[PDB]
RNA sequence: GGCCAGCAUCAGUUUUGGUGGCAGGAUAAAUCCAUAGGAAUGUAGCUUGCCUCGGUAAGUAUUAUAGCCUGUG
RNA sequence: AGAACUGGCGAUGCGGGAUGAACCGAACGUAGAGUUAAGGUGCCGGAAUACACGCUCAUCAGACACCACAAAAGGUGUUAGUUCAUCUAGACAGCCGGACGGUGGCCAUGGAAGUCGGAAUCCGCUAAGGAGUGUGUAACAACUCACCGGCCGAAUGAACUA
RNA sequence: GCAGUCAAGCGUUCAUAGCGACAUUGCUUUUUGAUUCUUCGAUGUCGGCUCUUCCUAUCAUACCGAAGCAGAAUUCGGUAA
RNA sequence: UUUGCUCCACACAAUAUAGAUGGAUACGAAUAAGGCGUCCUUGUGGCGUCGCUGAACCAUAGCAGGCUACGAAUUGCAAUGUCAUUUUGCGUGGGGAUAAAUCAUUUGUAUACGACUUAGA
């Protein structure tokens, strides 16, 4: 409903995100997907690795600069999955895939802006407990990514800079609840409680 | 078939306190202290006494339950190693060429090097894990004793030894040389 | 399907040499009173020299369950045609109704042996009156004093597509 | 030794006598009580006090309510209505925040526009006092 | 006075809902009421090592200081 | 390659099988509303990330007949099942104890008490202990266990089916 | 052309270390054949030279396992092109 | 030759929109486990409590929103009924800064031509 949506992608499944994204973005919603190195995927690591090494195998023989561009970053693996789900070869798929902005980690603009979660793709809800799942950062790194040890050095600064905000806010609102709980014993609230507020 | 409840139980001799929170075991004792991670298993834990603990799995279905008793043994081995401790007595064997073993402080931690493994010149070194103390028998000067609390460290180090002191490109039915474990026990009994 | 249990009474057509031809009863499980008759003539034509055109259906009534709010442990003798040869089986089912047991038979047979409704004949269905002649663990485990088990990993279904807090599986 | 801090989880668990709340059916929302257990995935129930029949049902169609009352295995409707009324389960239930929020939703939804305007007026009084106080 | 839209009253085709009356079936089965027996995933009661009001132990006990099943009406 | 009956393509578009002369559905005047076929409803893709009982996790999974392939033989990987059975007069798993004597039962005699080895077969003790299952000293010993018991207090092996 | 399954036997004793008959299941299209759909208003037709790439059913090289492997030397097999 | 150029301040005009007309409202991590409040022998602590949907939370009255510390009809029974935000120009007036590249010539660490590399008041 909001003009722009910010999707935390931790504990998510890739192809079950992308079928929601690829429709919500084709229907006119701007989406950004953030913390994509924390994505999750079905299947064991060796298996989902071979399913990439049998992709790197596929390159145009007479000149491989014409052929399938095997991207190694999670932000681009997800974009691959979505580009497949979208008719990117038209001005509708094109127009949609410019409504999307995918990142690794959470940059500042989407740092101080609320994040959400797609429940019909959370590994927690969907997958059986006991199944093996593979993490996209480990995968990308094993197929030739480079910037894993950076994202962890930045997102941690994000986290310690955010935890202090949360503590500030909590140690502000614990008194708002007290001074509005100290004000709920009047007719103004005994009457609202009958209306359902 | 999917069962309903398969539960094992873990006795606890005194002096021990077993702290769990989010499937992270921590055990203490006279000998020392230890920890373990079991996030990769679905399993519960309850405290009916300070004298024992009850571990449980629910429907499972013949795969979770085989890890149930496994976990039970792992925790039990852990308690055993932080109450008594583990002792692995390896021994040397050879025909002509002795094996000259010693401990050495390299740039980092301790190592244990062996020379004259069948006349070889390759001084083959082995790291010592952190949880291990280490010595030589004295009643007979042709053994070695690894020791500690964690069996999965002690035994892994002993195997790390006897896997590198293994002859290659020769008849093993004849070249029964190297070092090998001989006794597994404790350092209290 | 939404099986209903029928009571089918049929009869060879009455000729002068025997105008009281002896009647034959079958207790059939079917989705309706059209295929009930079909299965009657199917199983009868397997035992007695009679067809539809050489017979008539006297009665098709329904048998509604008497104590459908009483949990029971049925035992089910059955034969089934595999891809290579027939076999007989015995399976025990815990349910309230003699026909719900059959619904959950055809399914756990179509899964465990990939047998269709056409490759299955229900020989005998009957309660085990006492909880000591059961022979199967997948029933006997629910026959325990003071049963109680949890549902560990709960999943709350979303109506909307976006949520603003991580969901929680606790029950 | 020192007391062993051991804690895993304290589930509400399907048992005989447990109370449940039905989410998806003809008798949606209406409370009931489990009687006995058919298998892992389904049970039977009887809520007589609220007008629920004696059903056999799965556990997706319901929710497990924490509260619980004592009864024997396989009990009947009269017996269940006996025990329900003894324990005063609807009183233990309406006390809770769960039913309070449920009723609150059901009441917010049933508001005329007049009520929805009265609310806007009234909240412009409470917040005035609260913003005066948090100063 | 002509074109374009809106509403109503109607007509044809069709879609989607709320509600009532009736008939049948084992003149539904059931639940419920009554009643005759039976047993345990054995309730009280009584034996039973100590003890939380017999909590445990396991014998007895067939509704009793819970209940259930079956049959008939 | 060649015949029989029918239906089709040819001469035929249309919705479906991604695509396809023949398959499934169905046969065409131009248009509008409604309903369906066959096929399908995660997204591309219009339509349930619907409900229900289960099976499967594959270091070449598998996924719309025609159709674009796959076998014999195997697997305690798992699920369900069939037929035997042993057995609370305590089997089977697991440790603890004994396993002795008549007697080296005769010969191969360079040496075999059981045993590098060939003919040959029974008593005493008992809970039970092979005139011998293994290790092997020129031979003797000493060990092993099938034969029995203590804990044990549960049930269990064997074959087969799909 | 290649491989597999039973395994009667060879194998000083020892089916299967290695091989392995009588039978039997398949794979391949680098053979030869059968067929005749395309091409007869033309697809330049043997071999070699040159040059690149691919396949594995690996001759060698790397790490391993198994032998009737003492060593040495050999054979069988595996991951691997 | 402040004809020129560059800003910001407002006055109009002009061109375009992959599409807002209340608010994109911020902890982290686990899920066979956690959030919040308190006490504290500050611990993987004791107690209580919440979830079981954001159906929330916040804002929300006034000429399409006014005068003073009253006016609002007659868009005549509906006909977006005009506000969003980039890019361009015109002039008005208050400032601010005063250049390089290419051709041609040339060198050869370069070169098929272009290109590259160098030098030149």
Topology of this protein?
This is part of a larger assembly, with chains A (197 residues), B (189 residues), C (171 residues) and D (135 residues).
Chain A: E1 4-8, H1 14-24, E2 30-34, E3 40-42, H2 45-56, H3 74-85, H4 93-97, E4 100-102, H5 123-126, E5 133-135, H6 136-143, H7 148-181, H8 187-195
Helix pairs in contact in A: 1-3
Chain B: E1 6-11, E2 18-20, E3 24-28, E4 33-37, E5 44-46, E6 52-57, H1 64-83, E7 86-93, E8 100-105, E9 110-115, E10 124-127, E11 132-135, E12 143-148, H2 151-164, E13 178-186
Antiparallel strand pairs in B: 1-6, 2-3, 3-4, 5-6, 7-12, 7-13, 8-9, 9-10, 11-12
Chain D: E1 13-15, E2 18-22, E3 31-37, E4 42-46, E5 54-58, E6 62-68, H1 77-87, H2 89-94, H3 97-108, H4 113-133
Chain A binds four RNA strands through strand 1, helix 1, helix 2, helix 3 and helix 4.
What characteristics describe this protein?
part of a larger assembly; 4 chains; C: 171 residues; alpha+beta; Ubiquitin-like (UB roll); three-stranded antiparallel beta sheet; 3 helices; 7 strands; D: 135 residues; SH3 type barrels; 37% helix; extended; RNA-binding; ribosome; eIF6; Nmd3; 60S ribosomal protein L16-B
- Number of domain units of chain B: 2
Shape of chain A: elongated
Radius of gyration of chain B: 21 Å
In the sheet with the most strands of chain B, the strands line up as 11-12-7-13
Structure notes:
- This is part of a larger assembly, with chains A (197 residues), B (189 residues), C (171 residues) and D (135 residues).
- Chain A has helices spanning 14-24, 45-56, 74-85, 93-97, 123-126, 136-143, 148-181, 187-195, and strands at 4-8, 30-34, 40-42, 100-102, 133-135.
- In chain A, helix 1 crosses helix 3.
- Chain A is 48% helix and 10% strand.
- In chain A, helix 1 (14-24) links the parallel strand 1 (4-8) and strand 2.
- Chain C is an alpha+beta fold and 171 residues long.
- Chain C folds into two domains: 2-68, Ubiquitin-like (UB roll) (Roll), CATH 3.10.20; 69-145, Ubiquitin-like (UB roll) (Roll), CATH 3.10.20.
- Chain C has helices spanning 35-44, 100-112, 137-140, and strands at residues 4-12, 24-30, 55-62, 72-81, 86-95, 120-127, 148-150.
- In chain C, a hairpin with a 4-residue loop joins strand 4 and strand 5.
- Chain D is an alpha+beta fold.
- A five-stranded antiparallel beta sheet of chain D has the order 5-4-3-2-6.
- The chains are: A mainly alpha (197), B alpha+beta (189), C alpha+beta (171), D alpha+beta (135).
- Chains C and D meet through strand 7 of C and strand 1 of D.
- Strand 7 of chain C pairs antiparallel with strand 1 of chain D.
- Chain A binds four RNA strands through residues 1-6, 10-11, 15-16, 18-23, 26, 28, 30, 42-44, 46-47, 49-50, 54, 61, 81-82, 84-88, 91-96, 98-99, 106, 110-116, 120-121, 124-126, 129, 131-132, 159-160, 162-167, 169-170, 174.
């Amino acid at each position: 409903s909001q003009p722009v949506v910010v999707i935390d992608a931790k504990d998510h499944l890739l192809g079950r995100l992308a079928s929601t994204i690829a429709k919500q973005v084709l229907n006119g919603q701007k989406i950004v997907v953030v913390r994509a190195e924390a994505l999750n995927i079905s299947g064991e690591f060796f298996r989902n690795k071979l399913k990439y090494h049998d992709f790197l195998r596929k390159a145009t023989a007479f000149n491989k600069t014409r052929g399938p561009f095997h991207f190694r970053a999670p932000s681009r693996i997800l974009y691959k999955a979505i580009r497949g789900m979208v008719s990117h070869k038209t001005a509708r798929g094109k127009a949609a895939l410019e409504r999307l902005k995918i990142f690794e980690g959470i940059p500042p603009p989407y740092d101080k802006k609320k994040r959400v979660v797609v429940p019909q793709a959370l590994r927690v809800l969907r997958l059986k407990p006991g199944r093996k799942y593979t993490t996209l950062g480990k995968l990308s790194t094993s197929v030739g990514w480079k910037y894993e040890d950076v994202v962890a050095k930045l997102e941690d600064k994000r986290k310690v800079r955010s935890a202090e905000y949360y503590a500030k806010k909590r140690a502000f609102t614990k008194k708002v609840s007290s001074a509005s709980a100290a004000a709920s014993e009047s007719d103004v609230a005994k009457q609202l409680a009958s209306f359902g507020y | 078939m999917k069962y309903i409840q398969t539960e094992q139980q873990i006795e606890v001799p005194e002096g021990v306190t077993v702290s769990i929170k989010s499937r992270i075991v921590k055990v203490v004792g006279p000998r020392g202290t230890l920890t373990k991670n079991l996030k990769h298993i679905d399993v519960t834990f309850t405290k009916v006494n300070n004298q024992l603990i009850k571990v449980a799995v629910h429907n499972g279905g013949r795969k979770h339950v085989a890890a149930l008793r496994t976990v039970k043994s792992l925790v039990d081995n852990m308690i055993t190693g932080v109450t008594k401790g583990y002792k692995y007595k390896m021994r040397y064997v050879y025909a002509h060429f002795p094996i000259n073993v010693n401990i050495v402080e390299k740039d980092g931690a301790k190592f244990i090097e062996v020379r004259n493994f069948l006349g070889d010149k390759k001084i083959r070194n082995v790291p010592v894990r952190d949880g291990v103390t280490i010595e030589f028998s004295t009643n007979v000067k042709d053994e070695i004793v690894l020791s500690g609390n964690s069996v999965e460290d002690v035994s892994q180090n002993a195997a790390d030894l006897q896997q590198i002191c293994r002859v290659r490109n020769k008849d093993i039915r004849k070249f029964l040389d190297g070092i090998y474990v001989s006794h597994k026990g404790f350092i209290t009994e | 399907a939404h099986f209903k249990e029928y009571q089918v009474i049929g009869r060879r057509l009455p000729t002068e040499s025997v105008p009281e031809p002896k009647l034959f009863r079958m207790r059939i499980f079917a989705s309706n009173e059209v295929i009930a008759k079909s299965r009657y003539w199917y199983f009868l034509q397997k035992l007695h020299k009679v067809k539809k055109a050489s017979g008539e259906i006297v009665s098709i009534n329904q048998i509604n369950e008497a104590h459908p709010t009483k949990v029971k442990n049925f035992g089910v003798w059955v034969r089934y045609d595999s891809r290579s040869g027939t076999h007989n089986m015995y399976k025990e089912i815990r349910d309230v109704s003699r026909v719900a047991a059959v619904e959950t038979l055809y399914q756990d047979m179509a899964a465990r042996h990939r047998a269709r409704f056409r490759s299955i004949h229900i020989l005998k269905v009957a309660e085990i009156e006492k909880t000591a002649d059961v022979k199967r663990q997948y029933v006997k485990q629910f026959l325990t004093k003071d049963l109680k088990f949890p549902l560990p990993h709960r999943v709350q279904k979303s109506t909307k597509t976006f949520s603003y807090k991580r969901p929680s599986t606790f029950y | 030794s020192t007391d062993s801090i051991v804690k895993a989880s304290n589930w509400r668990l399907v048992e005989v006598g447990r109370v449940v709340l039905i989410k998806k059916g003809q008798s949606a929302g209406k409370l009931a009580a489990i009687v006995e257990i058919i298998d892992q995935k389904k049970v039977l129930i009887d809520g007589p006090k609220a007008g629920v029949p004696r059903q056999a049902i799965n556990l997706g169609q319901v929710v497990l309510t924490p509260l619980t009352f004592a009864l024997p295995r396989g009990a009947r409707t009269a017996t269940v209505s006996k025990k329900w009324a003894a324990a005063a389960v609807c009183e233990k239930w309406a006390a809770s925040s769960w039913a309070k929020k449920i009723a609150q939703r059901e009441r917010r939804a049933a508001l005329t526009d007049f009520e929805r305007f009265q609310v806007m007026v009234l909240r412009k009084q409470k917040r005035y006092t609260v913003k005066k106080a948090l100063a």
